Amino acid sequence: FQTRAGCLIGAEYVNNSYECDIPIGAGICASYQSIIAYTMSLGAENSVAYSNNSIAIPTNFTISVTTEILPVSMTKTSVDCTMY
Amino acid sequence: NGLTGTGVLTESNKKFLPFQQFGRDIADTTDAVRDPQTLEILDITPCSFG
Amino acid sequence: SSTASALGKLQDVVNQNAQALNTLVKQLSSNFGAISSVLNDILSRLDPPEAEVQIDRLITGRLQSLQTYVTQQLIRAAEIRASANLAAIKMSECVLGQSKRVDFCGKGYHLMSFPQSAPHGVVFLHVTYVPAQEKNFTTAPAICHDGKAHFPREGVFVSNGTHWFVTQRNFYEPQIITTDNTFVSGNCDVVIGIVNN
Amino acid sequence: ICGDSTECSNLLLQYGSFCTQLNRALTGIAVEQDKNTQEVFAQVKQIYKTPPIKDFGGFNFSQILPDPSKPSKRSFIEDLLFNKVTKFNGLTVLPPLLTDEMIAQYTSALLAGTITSGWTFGAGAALQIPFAMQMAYRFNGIGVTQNVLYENQKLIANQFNSAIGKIQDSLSSTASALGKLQDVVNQNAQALNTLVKQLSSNFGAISSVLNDILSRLDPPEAEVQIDRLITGRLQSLQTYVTQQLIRAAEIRASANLAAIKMSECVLGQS
Ligand SMILES: *[C@@H]1O[C@H](CO)[C@@H](O[C@@H]2O[C@H](CO)[C@@H](O)[C@H](O)[C@H]2NC(C)=O)[C@H](O)[C@H]1NC(C)=O
Ligand SMILES: *[C@@H]1O[C@H](CO)[C@@H](O[C@@H]2O[C@H](CO)[C@@H](O)[C@H](O)[C@H]2NC(C)=O)[C@H](O)[C@H]1NC(C)=O
Ligand SMILES: *[C@@H]1O[C@H](CO)[C@@H](O[C@@H]2O[C@H](CO)[C@@H](O)[C@H](O)[C@H]2NC(C)=O)[C@H](O)[C@H]1NC(C)=O
Ligand SMILES: *[C@@H]1O[C@H](CO)[C@@H](O[C@@H]2O[C@H](CO)[C@@H](O)[C@H](O)[C@H]2NC(C)=O)[C@H](O)[C@H]1NC(C)=O
Ligand SMILES: *[C@@H]1O[C@H](CO)[C@@H](O[C@@H]2O[C@H](CO)[C@@H](O)[C@H](O)[C@H]2NC(C)=O)[C@H](O)[C@H]1NC(C)=O
Ligand SMILES: *[C@@H]1O[C@H](CO)[C@@H](O[C@@H]2O[C@H](CO)[C@@H](O)[C@H](O)[C@H]2NC(C)=O)[C@H](O)[C@H]1NC(C)=O
Ligand SMILES: *[C@@H]1O[C@H](CO)[C@@H](O)[C@H](O)[C@H]1NC(C)=O
Ligand SMILES: *[C@@H]1O[C@H](CO)[C@@H](O)[C@H](O)[C@H]1NC(C)=O
């Protein structure tokens, strides 16, 4: 198969569209599912029911706990000269 | 004529003046040559790599 | 406990430092165009005339390697400093108080946070709030009464089909419309969408 | 630094693993750029679409919503911006992972979501609400009672339309309004060009071409001259890599700021 990034041998192009995990390039990307390659899908498409006299007020809530990790320091090292 | 190179040699549409011998563009990249026998101008481009 | 590979950043930092140090050590074995990679052998095989040349080649090669290592260390240190400055800002703004900037500490409206330590970093647990179970209703911007227009103090007008109520924006709690929670300003002839009620 | 030669490769093989480090650094910065744009733009879980009938209380978003007539599905301002901005030696250019079409799709989804829902779609699911009342809430945010907006709706709409038209005209006519991106492109191109041009330097040898200096001398002297050329080219390459690293770090900082601005000012009122 030929793509803007070059060519692919051993993978078969398909007309579907999934949120892929192995990027290839120029939108084309592959997944295992025999290895297949396709065009990534940006996400589920929905049309909001916009009008001029309607709203959407929530009636319930949930509480979520998420994580995030941040490094702050690395190992302190020193190096001599004459011994090195 | 003692100039060593590697690539694909194809037909060139350049216009060398009669005194010209060859051509280069940047960094001593010989882009076009004229053969020492037919006096017909060709151009060189390296074969594909990746 | 079960799902692994959730701490990629710290592992990457440790691996990068270890690999850089390892390749710095590995660079000793190179030849750099000299006769041998060990000083004792070339010292114990030649007179100083060419021995000094070989030593010079080895010295310049190793010096270049050391310079490269130091430069890479400096760049990585700058990156780590930027990351830790961001971490300190988040610690000050989301742990010691409630933040208002959107999507700074977790997805959804921020409630509170907890810090935890990690071998070379910090882990934030953000407790947030997320609405759900929506409805449709019908809406109007103001209400005519006796010729004057009423607007809601805080909240919004809704209607389930026959009657009108005022609720807050982020929850459904209908209440009867009263003078207490509405304020009046001028007659209703300019507003587009007033409803007679 | 060798260019299809065996003696040069053999001589280079004994200098260690500099080139592995160089390749690793370049690959790292490329992956960093890809992740950079992905995290800047991909902020929405879904892809929203504007309704066919557009009555936003008099506001007119025609010049920023996508135009189906244009094959690129880009709005007027995007087309103006794209039109206002202006080969084989051993180096290659990789294409970006995300095509500009998908970037346009993300932009359209974000704009439609913020037009219809407001700030609500940034926390949970998008919630419908008429545009005029969203603008009333936005005034109520800054200390001005909503009592103002409903008595000045037409005037506000006219002012907004005039402002957007003036912005369009200023971008269309006035030039040099996009100096930053043009400068970035110029810097990258100039650095690459001077790196290529450095390949023609004598560096103290007798010539700047490998084949001529190889087909003219015995191997013993070829060693010396190839060594000189190799060390010169290696130094130049190291300098180029360091400059690229510095520039990439600066660009990453700028992109982080851009992502912060997108998250704080588009999806909510700051
Ligand atoms: C709210 O009212 C709409 C109609 O005004 C209901 O119908 C939805 O309309 C949108 C856009 O036309 C569609 O995308 C949905 O699929 C429709 N829902 C259906 C057919 O069940 C809508 O269901 C009502 N409720 C909500 C929560 O939107
Ligand atoms: C949404 O549309 C308009 C404008 O906000 C309003 O209703 C329209 O009113 C005109 C004049 O009376 C009628 O000719 C239209 O048929 C109405 N409906 C439209 C344009 O859809 C009102 O604010 C809203 N209308 C509805 C039906 O919800
Ligand atoms: C809001 O959501 C919560 C969570 O689902 C609902 O609480 C559930 O109620 C059902 C019915 O009694 C129980 O079977 C579940 O065990 C409850 N969940 C929990 C976690 O206790 C709650 O009912 C919802 N609110 C409304 C008004 O329906
Ligand atoms: C809209 O809500 C109001 C208030 O809850 C409803 O009015 C009440 O409805 C219940 C159930 O039918 C009756 O028992 C009460 O007598 C009603 N109160 C009054 C003051 O009329 C109303 O029915 C709701 N409308 C719809 C369409 O569900
Ligand atoms: C709300 O009340 C006002 C005042 O009663 C209505 O305005 C007048 O209503 C009468 C009777 O329907 C009409 O004969 C007049 O022509 C109306 N005057 C104007 C200037 O419109 C108003 O119509 C009521 N609201 C609605 C939606 O009908
Ligand atoms: C929003 O603004 C655009 C730009 O002026 C309007 O498009 C113009 O519409 C008029 C009337 O049909 C035409 O004569 C112009 O040629 C249009 N201009 C362009 C550039 O196409 C558009 O009508 C406005 N939207 C609304 C709802 O009025
Ligand atoms: C399916 O994929 C082929 C190429 O693999 C393409 O030519 C074709 O347009 C696609 N769609 C259909 C309906 O065949
Ligand atoms: C060179 O010799 C060949 C064969 O003898 C002939 O065909 C050709 O025309 C000659 N070229 C010139 C420039 O005389």
Per-residue 3-state assignment (H helix, E strand, C coil) for D149-218: HHHCHHHHHHHHHHHHHHHHHHHHHCCCCCHHHHHHHHHHHHHHHHHHHHHHCCCCCCCCCHHHHHCCCC
Pocket test for ligand 4, best of C136, C138, C159, C160 (most atoms within 8 A of CB): C160
Helix (H, G, I), strand (E, B) or coil at D142: coil
Smallest CA–CA distance, residue C106 to chain A, in Å, is 6
Closest Cα to atom 6 of ligand 5:
C196
| A23:D97 CB<8 A | yes
Distance, in Å, from the CA atom of D192 to the CA atom of D214, rounded to the nearest integer, reads 28
CA of C192: how far to CAs of C129, D154, D267, in Å?
A: 35, 10, 27
CA of D40: how far to CAs of B3, D1, D26, D157, in Å?
A: 52, 37, 21, 31
CA–centroid distance, D156 to ligand 6, in Å, is: 18
Name the residue among C6, C21, C170 with its Cβ closest to that of A58: C170
Distance, in Å, from the CA atom of D162 to the CA atom of D155, rounded to the nearest integer, reads 11
Contact C80, A73 (CB under 8 A): yes
Give the H/E segment covering residue D10.
helix D6-12
**A54 touches ligand 2 (CB under 6 Å):** no
Pocket test for ligand 1, best of A45, A47, A59 (most atoms within 8 A of CB): A47
CA–centroid distance, A14 to ligand 1, in Å, is: 33
CA–centroid distance, C163 to ligand 4, in Å, is: 8
Calculate the CA C133 to chain-centre distance.
29
Within an 8 Å CB–CB cutoff, is residue D127 touching chain C? yes
Half-sphere exposure of C120 (CA within 13 A, CB side): 18
Give the H/E segment covering residue D231.
helix D219-261
Token pair in block for residue D239 = 């300098």
Contact C83, A71 (CB under 8 A): yes
Smallest CA–CA distance, residue A7 to chain D, in Å, is 13
How many other β-carbons are positioned within 10 Å of the β-carbon of residue D195? 19
Distance, in Å, from the CA atom of D129 to the CA atom of D119, rounded to the nearest integer, reads 11
Closest Cα to atom 13 of ligand 7:
A15
Write out residues with Cβ below 6 Å of ligand 1. A 47, 49; C 134, 136
Helix (H, G, I), strand (E, B) or coil at B24: strand
* DSSP structure string for A25-76: ETTEEEE----EEEE-----EEE----SS------EEEEEEEEEEEE-----
CA–centroid distance, B9 to ligand 2, in Å, is: 72
Within an 8 Å CB–CB cutoff, is residue C81 touching chain D? no
Contact D56, D131 (CB under 8 A): yes
Token pair in block for residue D132 = 């005029």
D156 closest CA partner among D50, D65, D60: D60
Find the largest Cα–Cα distance for chain A.
Answer: 81
| B28:D200 CB<8 A | yes
Within an 8 Å CB–CB cutoff, is residue B27 touching chain D? yes
**D53 touches ligand 2 (CB under 6 Å):** no
CA–centroid distance, C151 to ligand 2, in Å, is: 21
Give the H/E segment covering residue C113.
strand C109-118
Using CA atoms in the order D11, D17, D23, D29, what is the torsion angle rounded to 10 degrees?
A: -150
Distance, in Å, from the CA atom of D204 to the CA atom of D217, rounded to the nearest integer, reads 16
B48: DSSP letter: P
Q: Which residues contact D236 (CB under 8 A, 6 or more apart)?
A: D195, D198
Contact D100, D41 (CB under 8 A): no
Within an 8 Å CB–CB cutoff, is residue C26 touching chain D? yes
Q: Which residues contact D164 (CB under 8 A, 6 or more apart)?
A: D60, D63, D64
Distance, in Å, from the CA atom of D203 to the CA atom of D213, rounded to the nearest integer, reads 13
| D89:B4 CB<8 A | no
Resolution (A): 3.4
Using CA atoms in the order D115, D118, D119, D120, what is the torsion angle rounded to 10 degrees?
A: -120
| A47:D51 CB<8 A | yes
Residue pairs between chains C and D whose CB atoms are closer than 8 Å: 86
Cβ under 8 Å to D: C residues 41-60: none
Q: Rounded to the nearest 5 degrees, what angle is found at the Cα of B21, between the Cα atoms of B18 and B24?
A: 120
D67: DSSP letter: -
Within an 8 Å CB–CB cutoff, is residue A48 touching chain C? no
B2 closest CA partner among B27, B24, B19, B22: B22
Distance, in Å, from the CA atom of B18 to the CA atom of B7, rounded to the nearest integer, reads 25
Which chains would you list as touching A if contact means 3+ CB atom pairs under 8 Å?
C, D
Least CA distance to C90: which residue of chain A? A70
D199: chain B residues, CB-CB within 8 Å: 27-28
Technique used by the depositors: cryo-EM
Distance, in Å, from the CA atom of C184 to the CA atom of D203, rounded to the nearest integer, reads 86
D237 closest CA partner among D186, D198, D181: D198
D68: DSSP letter: T
Pocket test for ligand 6, best of D50, D55, D59, D60 (most atoms within 8 A of CB): D60
Name the residue among A42, A45, A46 with its Cβ closest to that of D106: A42
- D81-95 burial: b if 16+ Cβ within 10 Å, else e: eeebeeeeeeeeeee
Contact D12, D2 (CB under 8 A): yes
Distance, in Å, from the CA atom of C96 to the CA atom of C114, rounded to the nearest integer, reads 10
Chains B and C touch (3+ CB pairs under 8 A): no
| Count, residues in chain D | 270
Name the residue among D124, D130, D150 with its Cβ closest to that of C130: D124
Burial of A73 (0-12, 13-18, 19+ CB in 10 A): middle
